[PDB]
Amino acid sequence: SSDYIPDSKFYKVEAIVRPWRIQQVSSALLKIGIRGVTVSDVRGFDKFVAKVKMEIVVKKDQVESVINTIIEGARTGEIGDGKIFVLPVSDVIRVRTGERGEKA
Amino acid sequence: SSDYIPDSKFYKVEAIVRPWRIQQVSSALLKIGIRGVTVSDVRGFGEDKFVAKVKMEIVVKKDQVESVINTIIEGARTGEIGDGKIFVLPVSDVIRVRTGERGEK
Amino acid sequence: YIPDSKFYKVEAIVRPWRIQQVSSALLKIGIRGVTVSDVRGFDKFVAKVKMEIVVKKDQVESVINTIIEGARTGEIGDGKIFVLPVSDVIRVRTGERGEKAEKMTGDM
């Protein structure tokens, strides 16, 4: 489906992916014109597995391309490739300008 | 209540807990059959003075939420100020990178 | 706000040197417990910090404003603020949920 629940104007696409696929996902997202990915280091299972959380907040009508493009850049075929979560976002505000909603 | 607003198929459970309680929360969740926990380092400023905490993140179905909450409390509670908080956030969809499977699949 | 919720997470992706200003400004409006982490923007990266705070619905506007005050420089790269609905808040120590759990009760 595409009418995600809860309904929202904006969504966070949160990807937990391999650390070495950072640029591959970033580049692929650039090829569809989406900029402004935020990246942070996380770890799954003192034994851990190093992962990278990639966040980008987008309009509802962009979510499917983003998902597909992250998969494209993140998939290696092996177990440990990660997951992608789609979370509703009520509002986006640009700090510099104070612009809310679509103007942000 | 169990009917959380906003209503969703999945929910993210976010636990900000003491760093030395990582293994205990991880294992307690393991005993109820839950894996896929991811952890990151956070700093609580609530000089450059902070308290070191860890954020523990898991995404589960709506019917798993209460079991996850209680199991994190069990793994993380010491009884002293600074045990942390748990946040429950709606998640619209979950997608496995390797396979493309969405929803419950 | 859509979706409607009792609580909202306010995530602020801002400059690393703006922690104290954002922090202090929030304390003046009665928000004591901000959570901070290292994040990177776009091998070259831009260093930023994610500041996370969960508040009641009626506090969100005031929290957006206060963060802007502490974080705005006027320069390109001031960051963005995201508002996400939070279904429930639980205090680990006591098991308290809802309003009797939102306030940060740690030492200063």
Domains of chain A, by residue range, sit at: 1-104
Question: Architecture of domain A1-104 in CATH?
Answer: 2-Layer Sandwich (3.30)
Give the residue on A whose Cα is nearest the Cα of B34.
Answer: A45
B84 is in an annotated binding site: yes
A45 is in an annotated binding site: yes
B87 is in an annotated binding site: no
B38 contacts B22 by C-beta, under 8 angstroms = no
Q: Do C91 and B85 touch (CB under 8 A)?
A: yes
Chain C partners of A38 at a C-beta cutoff of 8 Å? 13, 39-41, 48, 50
- Candidates A17, A70, A88; nearest CB to B92: A88
Q: Do C80 and A88 touch (CB under 8 A)?
A: no
Chain Cα centroid distance, residue C25: 12
CA torsion angle for A32, A38, A39, A42 (degrees, to 10)? -120
Chain C partners of B53 at a C-beta cutoff of 8 Å? 35
Q: Which of 3.40.50.11540, 1.25.40.10, 3.40.190.10, 3.30.70.120 is the CATH number of C1-108?
A: 3.30.70.120
Q: Do B89 and C93 touch (CB under 8 A)?
A: no
Please return the burial class of C38, using the count of CB atoms within 10 Å of its CB with bins 0-12, 13-18 and 19+. Answer: middle
- Candidates C39, C67, C72; nearest CB to A39: C39
- Could you say which residues from 36 to 95 on chain B have a Cβ atom under 8 Å away from some Cβ of chain C? 40-46, 48, 50-51, 53, 55, 69, 72-73, 76-90
B11 contacts B4 by C-beta, under 8 angstroms = yes
Least Cα separation, residue C76 to chain B (angstroms)? 25
Sign, Cα dihedral of B105, B37, C50, A30: negative
**CATH number of this structure's domain B1-105:** 3.30.70.120
Q: Give 3-state DSSP helix, strand, coil % of chain B, rounded to 5.
A: 25, 35, 35
- Contacts of B among chains (3+ CB pairs under 8 A): A, C
Tokens 């005993």, located at residue: B31
**Closest CA relative to residue B98, chosen from A61, C100, A82:** A82
β-pair partners for C51: C12, C36
Give the residue on C whose Cα is nearest the Cα of A99.
Answer: C80
Interruption sites in chain A after residues (C→N beyond 2.5 Å): 45
Experimental technique used to determine this entry: X-ray
Angle at B45 between CA A91 and CA A96, to 5 degrees: 40
- Residues contacting residue B33 through CB under 8 Å, at least 6 positions apart: none
Chain B partners of A6 at a C-beta cutoff of 8 Å? 6-8, 90, 92
Backbone angles phi, psi at C56, to 5 degrees: -65, 155
Least Cα separation, residue A86 to chain C (angstroms)? 12
- Rounded Cα distance between C13 and A77, Å, is 32
- Residues contacting residue B15 through CB under 8 Å, at least 6 positions apart: B25, B55, B56, B57, B72, B76, B84, B85, B86, B87, C92
**Closest CA relative to residue A27, chosen from A46, A54, A47, A57:** A54
